[model samples]
Target: ENLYFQGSSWKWVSTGPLVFPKNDERNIAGIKDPTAVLINGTYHVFASTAKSEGYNMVYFNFTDFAEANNAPFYYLDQAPLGYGYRAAPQVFYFEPHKLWYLVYQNGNAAYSTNPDINDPSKWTAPEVFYPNGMPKIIADNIGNGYWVDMWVVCDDEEDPNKALCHLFSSDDNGHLYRSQTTLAQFPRGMSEPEIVLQDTQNIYALWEAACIYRIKGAEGTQKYLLLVEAIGQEGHRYFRSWTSDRIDGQWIPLADTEANPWAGEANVVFEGQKWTKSISHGEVIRTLTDQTLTLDLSEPIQFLYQGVDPNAQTEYNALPWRLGLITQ
Candidate 1:
């Protein structure tokens, strides 16, 4: 345990854009905010697609990174997801129900379920997590903030009878919050969110895109790792991280600074041409594909993230964001 979750210093090598927006139809502008899982040998990914109408979700898969560009794309614009804007998708398999869940933000935190993740049509209609509407903690303290990028993870180490699943999210305003429910009541009985971590210094501004995972080999309580994007120098974005023993407990900063970040330009190097300046939003390639989102500390670390060209003279909505891979 001492060798793992040590210092904040990180070194990463990045791959060129692995995935890009296909311009066949749907007025594809850019693709960002990806959630991926490796089932069998194929990489299945779901991410937000930028279009003229609004944001929508798209699904794609590939067996190897070399074939990423050729992987077919599926737009999930059927019924409920079609009725409104959806972005920042988080997909995982729930152990208790033997069902897969796709959680995202639709003006408010929402979710959909599926028996088979490979079948796009299997995903059920969208349902809001907070049925009573945005929780009072968020609504009262958000001020001028917007709630976006929803993520969920379950405590795998807990006993089967008393397990709990936790939902995490961030407001555009420097705050990270968490709400939870028992493993038996997940996707249903989440408690009101409470601020778990805040950037009182105001330098990073916390931003959006909150990702939490359980470190595979860590001991009790010190088993989780948290990653959140932050606005960096000149409006560019990067990631900061923390570690915690328990999902509901306080987080200890791992690499949460500009000088030493979890995944930022300072510590990352490009394999080819530097494609993007901002790390943006993405997921760590988990060792297991279940709700735990487990990251094996015994193996190398890799992150699949969205990035945009820093020199691009385009608006925020259409910055040509693409997907890239970074390894440590």
Candidate 2:
């Protein structure tokens, strides 16, 4: 965990723009929002294509991590009934049912599933999950609007008997929700969403894109960590973490100060230094890098996200977001 926070402990495997192919339709410019899940012995990456490139969940397999630059790539849109949209996708494996799900939000914010995800051609058509768009909690300030990142997490370790999948939806503004789906049928199969965390006391006024993890402990322990995207005082995109005693408990900010500050800026996972500072919209590898597939929250972690070097102009938007890995 050294140098994993506000300081300079992160060293990238590469200041990357991976050398992958461009078929004129997918990933033509660049890719971002990398969500990773390991299957068998392979690491699968699902991400959004650069602007005008594609909006679907394009993926690549990496059995040999070093060969990812030239690995075989495919897009969900290429499937006969596949779907595409502009959003940060949440993709993961469902252990209880042994199915993989890729979820997103832009319109109705739908999701798709596959039993065997080694091939993009076999994924089911994207189906609507959140019909009413993003839920409006704060009556006056928060507008009724479209959701951006709709993430899903299962309490496999905490609630062993119930295959309950919780949906965390963010407005990309400053608020997010926690909704559940019993019986494990996600998207439209879940119940109405409720706000789990929001912009109260202006605490969340500038945060979104949440990822949750349940820390490993005794059966009665219900500790969790939430990672979110926030622009630093310099307009650089960075990630921060909050802790909680329950999946639905109130969040407490994490930091380096003694005793820590109550409701303070989250501990910086990685902020822009010499490398371009545009880091946002990504997920940590939930499961370990081994056969047990136990959650890796308590262990040293490596984070994957989109970033670029500042060049020509302060804006790296047109530069096509490349991938970066920061270890804890």
Candidate 3:
């Protein structure tokens, strides 16, 4: 079977914002950059919480989308290391350590781990992967763009005991950087960043909020999908994709244009209200909630993304981003 997914017609049906900013004391203006995992028949979600002051993180869970808005939501400030400015979370279970890791950026690429996914207060203190500071390679080429949204994925094809893990991040300047480390040194020892993809033709083409996943059911060489958020024609955000046979291999553009985006306003149809014009950052409902972030093509491709009303003319921090689901 052909390994690429860009040639196929990709239209998605979207639900109205299922998770929105709660009108309460936390004063959350929006929510975005969601990472989810299903366990024990419930979905546990962690997302970046936007406030007028700055950004933070939140944890919420629900058994169904119908009840997601009313789910038990908790601000991560309650956790010891959750306080201060932090955003763009990526959570996964490290089977080798039997621990759950919540990877995000504090001042630098930092992480916190817990043995229990359900306990928001149990997360350990934040530890920087790059002990000194931002790597020289990313800093030199990042230009004026902001550095955010750190994502990690391990090469599943390699032996579990000796697997290589890659940490991916974007400089808002249309460049995506990758840093490598062994599975044994994950959540640490990631260094020497290199530009894996660059889109100089379109400024900020490979914007922040990147998710990489292993695509299941592909014959011969194992396939992987790369989704990077980019600004579209109207300054609306959309997801463009690339494909590769290995996690460390070359990334060939699949559906990377505004005309045929992987997930954008151009290809998405709203079920009820067209609440948002931007199909922004989020993650897939993975087949396996592990470090590899594998997606099974045989299953429906459902992406949990952030969307906002197009009419809102608020500041970037004040935009009312909400969570929505899009099914392929």
lDDT, candidate 2, equals: 0.58
Cα error, residue 30 of model 1, in Å, equals 1.2
Over 57-90, each residue of candidate 3 has an lDDT whose tens digit, in order, gives: 9999898987899986788988986579898999
Per-candidate Cα RMSD to the true structure, in Å, reads 1.9, 5.2, 1.9
lDDT (Cα, 0-100) at 5 in candidate 1: 52
- Pairs clashing in candidate 1? 221-245, 221-246, 222-245
Q: Point out the higher-scoring one by TM-score: 1 or 3.
A: 3
Q: What is the clash count for each candidate, in the order shown?
A: 3, 1, 0
- The count of residue-pair clashes in candidate 1 stands at 3
Off by over 4 Å in 1: 1-6, 157-161, 200-203
Give the clashing pairs for model 3.
none
Pitting candidate 2 against candidate 3, the one with the higher TM-score is 3
- Strongest candidate by lDDT: 3
Name the weakest run of 10 consecutive residues (lDDT summed) in model 2: 256-265
